Scaffold this motif. Sequence first.
Motif, short mmCIF file in Angstrom:
data_model
loop_
_atom_site.label_atom_id
_atom_site.label_comp_id
_atom_site.label_asym_id
_atom_site.label_seq_id
_atom_site.Cartn_x
_atom_site.Cartn_y
_atom_site.Cartn_z
N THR A 241 120.46 77.18 77.41
CA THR A 241 120.12 76.76 78.79
C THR A 241 121.11 77.38 79.78
N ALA A 270 115.35 72.83 72.31
CA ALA A 270 115.93 72.58 73.65
C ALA A 270 116.34 73.88 74.35
N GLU A 272 115.60 76.80 77.27
CA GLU A 272 115.14 76.78 78.67
C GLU A 272 114.04 77.83 78.93
N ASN A 289 108.77 75.60 70.45
CA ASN A 289 110.00 74.93 70.99
C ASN A 289 109.80 73.42 70.92
N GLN A 291 111.30 70.37 72.56
CA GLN A 291 112.09 70.30 73.81
C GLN A 291 113.38 69.51 73.55
N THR A 296 113.39 69.73 80.68
CA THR A 296 112.18 70.55 81.02
C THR A 296 111.59 71.23 79.77
N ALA A 297 110.26 71.45 79.77
CA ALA A 297 109.57 72.32 78.79
C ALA A 297 110.15 73.74 78.88
N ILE A 298 110.28 74.44 77.75
CA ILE A 298 110.62 75.89 77.78
C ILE A 298 109.69 76.64 78.75
N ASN A 316 105.21 74.11 73.56
CA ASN A 316 106.29 73.14 73.87
C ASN A 316 105.84 71.75 73.40
N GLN A 318 107.32 67.84 72.83
CA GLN A 318 108.41 66.91 73.27
C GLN A 318 109.00 66.33 71.99
#
Lengths: 545, 545, 545
Positions: A241, A270, A272, A289, A291, A296-298, A316, A318
């Motif tokens: 990130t 996680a 970005e 991904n 998250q 935030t979602a990738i 993405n 969660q």
Amino acid sequence: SFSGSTATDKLRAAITLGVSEVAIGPVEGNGGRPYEFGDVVIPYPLRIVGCGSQGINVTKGTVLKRSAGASFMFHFTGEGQAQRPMGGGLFNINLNGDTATALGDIIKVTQWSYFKANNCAFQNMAGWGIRLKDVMESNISGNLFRRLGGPSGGGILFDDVRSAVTDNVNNLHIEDNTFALMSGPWIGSTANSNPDLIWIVRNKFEFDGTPAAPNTVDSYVLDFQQLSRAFIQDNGFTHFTTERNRYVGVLRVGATAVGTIKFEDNLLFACESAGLIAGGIVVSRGNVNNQGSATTAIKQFTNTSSKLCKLERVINVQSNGNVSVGQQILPDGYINMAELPGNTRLPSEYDADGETTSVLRVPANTQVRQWSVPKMYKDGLTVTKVTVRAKGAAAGAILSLQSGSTVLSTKSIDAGVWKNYVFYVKANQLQETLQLRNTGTADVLADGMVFGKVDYIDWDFAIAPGTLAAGAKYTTPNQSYLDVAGMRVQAVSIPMFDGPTTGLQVWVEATSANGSFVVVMKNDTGSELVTTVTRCRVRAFVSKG
Amino acid sequence: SFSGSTATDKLRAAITLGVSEVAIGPVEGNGGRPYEFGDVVIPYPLRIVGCGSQGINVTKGTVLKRSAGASFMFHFTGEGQAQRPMGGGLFNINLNGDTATALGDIIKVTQWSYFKANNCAFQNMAGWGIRLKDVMESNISGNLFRRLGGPSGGGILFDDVRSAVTDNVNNLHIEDNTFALMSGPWIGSTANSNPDLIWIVRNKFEFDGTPAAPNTVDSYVLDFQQLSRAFIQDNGFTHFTTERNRYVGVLRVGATAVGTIKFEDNLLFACESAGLIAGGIVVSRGNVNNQGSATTAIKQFTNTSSKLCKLERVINVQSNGNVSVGQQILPDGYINMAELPGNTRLPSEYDADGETTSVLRVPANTQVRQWSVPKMYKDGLTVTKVTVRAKGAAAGAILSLQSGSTVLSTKSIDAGVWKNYVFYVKANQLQETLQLRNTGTADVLADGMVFGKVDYIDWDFAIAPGTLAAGAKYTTPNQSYLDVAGMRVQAVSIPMFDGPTTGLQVWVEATSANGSFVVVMKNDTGSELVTTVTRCRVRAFVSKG
Amino acid sequence: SFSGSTATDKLRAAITLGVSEVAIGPVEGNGGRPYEFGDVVIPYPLRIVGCGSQGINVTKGTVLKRSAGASFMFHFTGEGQAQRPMGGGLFNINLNGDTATALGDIIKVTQWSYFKANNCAFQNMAGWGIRLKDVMESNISGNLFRRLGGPSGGGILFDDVRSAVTDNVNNLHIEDNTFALMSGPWIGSTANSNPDLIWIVRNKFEFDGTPAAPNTVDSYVLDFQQLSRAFIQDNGFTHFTTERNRYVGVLRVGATAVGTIKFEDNLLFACESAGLIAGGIVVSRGNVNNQGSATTAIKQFTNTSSKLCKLERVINVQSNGNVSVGQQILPDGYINMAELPGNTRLPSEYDADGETTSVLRVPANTQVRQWSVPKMYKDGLTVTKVTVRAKGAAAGAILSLQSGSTVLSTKSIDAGVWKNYVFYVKANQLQETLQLRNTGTADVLADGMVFGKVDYIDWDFAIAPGTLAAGAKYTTPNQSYLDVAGMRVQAVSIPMFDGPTTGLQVWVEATSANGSFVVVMKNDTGSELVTTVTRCRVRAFVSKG
């Protein structure tokens, strides 16, 4: 077992003597302390075996430090040599820098082939862990890279070519490694590296923390200004990130990259952004991904490449298993124009409103693309249709659909807006190939198209019913199945018109078995009727026969 | 450290004594020169460690030459033994032939398991680098193969089985290697090898040049007369062309291969052809060729296999990034018949005009294929349609669409030409499965089909309007929604006919809410009208309810 | 070269002294017999080199037996230590249990990092070959596992976490191995393992036979109660059936697994079932089973996961090359609802009659899913349609299609049955996103949907023709193109009605160029006609303009 004041001198004796293998022992036989080396030059394939391990710790096997002001520790080079060095390298060794902010490199390899670095470690220095120049057929698998790099550093660099563009890094394996707590490019290449056939497969990459020298600029874990054939597959990437030492994305590819780069089946946590692709042919699919703790979602790749990219979504999910970003919902049958073949080099460019943000620029008097017609459609009994999404660069662009040099249909292209342009091919017109050409005076931007069989065709024709007395009727000219569809017509819609048909009773009379017809319009009002319509239209349905 | 005149004798002492590991030293301890061996037999798992490297050069570590007229250098065999040898092999050794035209082999392995050859080299001889027979659970990764083979030679051969078909090569890893400047098969198998579970993954293959013995016949880099389960993935292949030592293709698979062979995600440069598949189940996808300096786009696999192959295009990109060969443009919803399940073995055969060149031959009174109906379509309110592309071998082939033993529709198949055959399933006829059968007297060739939901059905029916007086009318028999669609009809097209309807005013009267109808035909001419039509037809539209 | 009565004591001296590498010799230097060890504790990264091989046999290199009543042979642990052990492990060693029914373990590893076990063997014991707890960044490739496990045993176990859920097995490579003739889980994990980033790639797995301790319960080759990111790819699996020591399936994933698990490109032979997925995100594709001698086609995964799974068929080919189980035939354009994005966590559950057996449960006043509209459709001239397959949990569920908070269409959902629900979007209604919401009072189960462009829309409207005198006519209210399609209408079908229209002559009059219309109904009977219809309907066709 060699003569000299320090280890630097002890080891150089071995090289002058030209011994094939130089075994080195643990921290026990030098009493807790690691053999220190600096600016050593190796002009022949020398193996340096160890009794150490891939690991962080320095208290239980072969361990090496760089000397207090050394530029490098080893430099395996074949510069000036008359036979290229081919072999040897580092095995079972925990290599280290002098300080946590020392610049320069740890290992240089130059003018080399079949270099290998197995079961080692590269750590604690703010420069480059491994710097490669004109290194071919090599292998760097099963190592650790940690607390490396910063503003002037990184993990592995593919440096400029030595002389010719063909004096490059190629046929290199980077497998089974672990990268953590680093700065700069964790693997990278220069604007003049020209690398080819690179495997970056089944590694772990994870942030972990900021090392001694934080990043000063927006950074990427994999940062390749140039890159040809590459496998970047089956890797983990974790917690990259902006706020975690400015990793704004996972992969950046430079404007002069060639590809093909395969970014496939990587499992992110996680992260970005997938990153930024400014060039090359890049294929991305099967990436996912979780998250996790990220807020935030990738983000998906930003694509500005002048070449075909096939970028399927990074899914993405969660942490609770909920999809928040799924597969891209494409128009059914959509094909981006750059996936099709064609006879002219047409650079791709960015348009925010293109289905994939990537669109072709096609000049005046140039082919867009050409494709082969499926065999099943080539039976003389199939109507096909082309819908192409296009935008004029300026007034006067025209798209023609052609069968070779024969022109089937043309459409004027509106300047400054994306619009869908529909071309029908009658059944008696379809041959081996179709092409779209710009036959106008301005550039057209071409997004993508939908090509396939249809079970109808729309038909509009001239009529002139004029003024009809009470009870009089008008019959339209004959509408042949040849002109309508190029094949038998099954049936037609109710006819419609370019205006109101108030007080006209309308029916259809067949003029043959093959679905040719006229429309009959009868004055049902009981006094003089002045008609206003000049055009009639139907949807014509086609089956077979 | 063993007793004898020559190295051949020195080493045999170790074997008779039966030592587990036999370390060998570099070119320093034998003064610039490589230990020469010939016809040595090893009947137990002996390790031969070295202090050498994967590489071409012979001036800086363990190096071995074959003796001037030796058939082999080593032969790791368990022939006649009572406990199968399980282990050992070659490590860190630059193995070599006596001359550049010497025939025979370098290493034989027979009646063996868990053989390994890591970080070595196999080069300069016109025979086979490694010859394997009944070798299981082995591993050959991280080696070089160079200036091997020719008319009677190659890199790695999978030889005939030893006794039973199950006495074969299986569970073999070939990874992380480099192959260059060779002749014959670079990896190959015999007509009686029966190999299974072979990994050929993440290797480089490159022409580089013609060695001492050029090829005498049209050749293939990978040439497998037999091959079952195989991973051929994530490899580079570079400059394989006819003019560059007669590499006419990358892969050839023989007529009696079983598969499944996965040829996936290989990155080719200036290769002439993917090659030739004459047998086996083969899956090819994700392959891309950069044409580079080649004068032509790569050719696709030639397929003559009697079994299902799924061959997605090898994409051809020119050096400037332009696609010149893209994905195959298939008919929408196309499925090759061999991808479907069925109760009868039906060999595939070649037809140049089939969508994939591969078609089934279905005899008289035989099932073509059977499939499951999607759950979403099984709601009693869905009309479906089958279009199948077929060619009669001779007069009298018939295709029936069936729900189990119930016959829904039959079509006569025209001899000698490919034609599309359309079968509708009324909504009240659709159950769990559908099948197509040959119910005729001749073979039919079946290419592929398109199955799915439709929102209309075409309907044709008998009428007899006869001779109508001035102002008289005829009403057709009732057209029930049951007979038309098997479910509610939403609406119909304008009716058409098997001839002209000059002077007839035609309309449609509903006979129920569920879209049953009659057609009304009224004499609008003002004198006697002798009609000629005997058939009426509509397109009937279906929604739900 | 160390002091003590037995090998257990001899070796412990080395550990107390704290030597980095402890070389061990073959069965020659201990006269035919293997060094026996028991309950040894290793609290620092110690390498144990050997001169042995991956293999079954015990007569030709380093070989180790466990002592007659020992719980373990080695236990590499960092429990109570102040610096985590990082490195070392087993190399070139044929490890063994004391008896074929001995329980316990052979190797334990606890509170460790960068453990490696290369070119060894683990065999003959009824407990666990390798037991891992809080083991990170490790590697176990190139080994044999044979005659391991049973009711309390197996190959490799990922045990409970040590303290925190983050004290787990992670970044572990299991590659290039061979597993045969074993019982229990061949690789497994506990209900509290929390493993992440596991590679199980390019291994052989084969039954071979039942070992000393047969299985007592229905078993799985890969049995993971928990598992996050995992690559399970490019493996062989051979002869796993119920009758062959109760291998009822290849893979089982437990209810609290997270995924993402990639089960891809595995090549199976005579396996009975892919297995059972009760949790996690699981992606399965490119798997193929040759049925061989098995009496039945492989069974597909049973899926009861609360999370998105994407399970493409394991293709079943018979030994003669005939497909008996092909790709799943999906409804064209089908998307399972769990593949779409959405703002609410919605657990998936099993329904035998769902297209994939997996369906969402959506409570009252909750979003189902939301998606982005393709750019090509957003031109103000495209009619789209949503068909969604749904089942009410009880009376009173309602589905609404919306553009943000604007409601386009609602349907009442029938309780207890799967039905298809159709929603049209007029061309003037389509914006950036669409969503489906439950706006009712009961749960709805949502299977999947089909979204796309359509070239028609169905329209039904109020009429009141009443009682018509001889020759009188009725004209319907105007049907504007705005209300019908939201855009220009190309044409319409023949009109139909909610009852019989006996004796009515019906035609259509355009009221504008843009396809607005009225229907005209004229009494053609010559006496008073009492009509019964109250509704009229057409299919309306749309093109562009």
